[PDB]
């Protein structure tokens, strides 16, 4: 575990897959008694494990709470796991990959899986909108541009 942030790095996918699904609708029949949208509210959670040397397995857990008025509507949760090969990345480099890049790979799959399970219980759309944390990161540590002179091109 190095801390300097200056190495060639490397990444690779071995496998993407759903490990766990939950859609638990306790007052599922009471959606017929409740004439209004459930308040569907997101949760992100970070769970990971090591399979081998330079072979990690990052699980993206998105939990979801929903409620009709003063009562629970449904409670959903998906765990999209993914085996990622990481090496070279260290300190802030590795915190950027495991904490933004690997999530944003698994995140479309967790979205699609939740929003499907929600609608199976005859509830409406709630897919979590994507955030460019990388765009924030480039300004956070100040990367700037290739300072010199601009080209036009003519064709």
């Amino acid at each position: 575990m190095s801390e300097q942030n200056n190495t060639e790095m490397t990444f690779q996918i071995q496998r993407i897959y759903t490990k766990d699904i939950s859609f638990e609708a306790p007052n599922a029949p009471h959606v017929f008694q409740k004439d209004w949208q459930p308040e569907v509210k997101l949760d992100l959670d970070t769970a990971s494990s090591q399979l081998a040397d330079d072979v990690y397995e990052v699980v993206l857990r998105v939990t979801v709470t929903a409620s009709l008025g003063e009562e629970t509507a449904f409670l959903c949760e998906v765990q999209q796991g993914g085996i990622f090969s990481i090496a070279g990345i260290e300190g802030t480099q590795m915190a950027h990959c495991l904490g933004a890049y690997c999530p944003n790979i698994l995140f479309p799959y967790a979205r699609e899986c939740i929003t499907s399970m929600v609608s199976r219980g005859t509830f409406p759309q709630l897919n979590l909108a994507p955030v460019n944390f990388d765009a924030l990161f480039m300004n956070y540590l100040q990367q700037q541009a290739g300072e010199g002179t601009e080209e036009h091109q003519d064709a």
Binding site: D35, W36, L44, D54, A87
Partner: protein, 40 residues
């Protein structure tokens, strides 16, 4: 002494991950509305 690249025990997942709470402005209406079932 020691092989492999770096490895980690999940040290501080990024510089925080904020998200939106909830929105859409949906509704039901069993009287010929939506997301309902007014009996087949």
């Amino acid at each position: 002494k020691g092989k492999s690249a770096l490895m980690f025990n999940l040290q501080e997942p990024y510089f925080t991950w904020p998200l939106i709470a909830a929105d859409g402005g949906y509704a039901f209406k069993y009287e010929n509305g939506k997301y309902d079932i007014k009996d087949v």
